């Protein structure tokens, strides 16, 4: 059976901020931008590994996040409404009040991955917009 997961986006955090999948699990994931501000803001959902931050040669208290080195969804065939196939550099960007639902089979990419939002030059990320995705071997 397909396992339904929802990730809600708020300013500036995911609910839930942890998720666990098994390799080979059939997942339907809904990403919902529930931005609570007036006006609501856009949010991004990207799963990857190895944070990349801005550099200018000067030390920082908090590094400004810019992206992931490795995208979890690389090569992963996705179905969303009438469309099926892998998506190059997959990520989900939503305006306030918009959601996106897609399904896939969890690839053989075991271990810890992270999800994050890199919008507004890393400000969402610095404010809490990051989660942890654990991928367990097939049960
Ligand atoms: Cu965001």
């Amino acid at each position: 059976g397909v396992h339904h997961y929802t990730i809600d986006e708020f300013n500036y955090y995911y609910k839930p901020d942890r998720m666990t999948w098994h390799v080979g699990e059939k997942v339907e994931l809904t990403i919902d931008n529930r931005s609570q501000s007036a006006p609501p803001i856009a949010h991004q959902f990207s799963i990857g590994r190895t944070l990349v931050s801005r550099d200018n040669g000067f030390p920082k208290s908090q590094a400004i996040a810019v992206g992931w080195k490795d995208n979890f969804f690389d090569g992963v065939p996705i179905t969303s409404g009438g469309q099926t196939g892998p998506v190059p550099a997959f990520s989900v960007s939503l305006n306030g009040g918009q959601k996106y639902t897609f399904s896939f089979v969890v690839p053989n990419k075991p271990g810890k991955w992270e999800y994050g939002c890199f919008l507004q030059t890393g400000q969402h990320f610095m404010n809490g917009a990051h989660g942890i995705l654990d991928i367990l071997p097939a049960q």
Side-chain angles (χ1 to χ4, degrees):
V2 182
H3 296 160
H4 177 77
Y5 293 80
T6 293
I7 297 175
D8 294 333
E9 303 163 334
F10 300 98
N11 309 353
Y12 296 90
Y13 66 91
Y14 295 109
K15 184 190 165 221
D17 62 10
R18 290 186 70 112
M19 192 162 272
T20 302
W21 297 332
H22 289 72
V23 171
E25 181 176 0
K26 295 185 245 175
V27 171
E28 177 195 80
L29 179 53
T30 295
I31 310 298
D32 187 7
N33 183 348
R34 301 190 77 93
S35 176
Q36 65 274 36
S37 54
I41 61 174
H43 288 298
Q44 169 183 51
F45 176 81
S46 181
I47 311 188
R49 272 174 171 162
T50 312
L51 182 65
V52 184
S53 298
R54 300 217 322 98
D55 177 73
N56 65 5
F58 290 98
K60 303 296 146 214
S61 288
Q62 283 189 98
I64 306 292
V66 302
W68 303 115
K69 279 219 142 70
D70 301 325
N71 185 338
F72 174 77
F73 283 113
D74 279 357
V76 175
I78 278 162
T79 294
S80 185
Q83 184 173 294
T84 290
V87 174
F90 179 77
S91 68
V92 178
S93 282
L94 291 170
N95 291 327
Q98 302 184 328
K99 67 179 169 169
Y100 175 74
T101 299
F102 65 109
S103 63
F104 60 94
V105 173
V106 173
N108 187 12
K109 291 181 193 192
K112 164 178 136 150
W113 289 84
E114 303 182 67
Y115 47 109
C117 177
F118 298 100
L119 301 188
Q120 304 197 281
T121 72
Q123 282 293 318
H124 300 199
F125 196 100
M126 188 176 293
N127 295 349
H130 47 86
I132 301 302
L133 173 65
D134 287 313
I135 307 296
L136 300 188
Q139 179 169 1

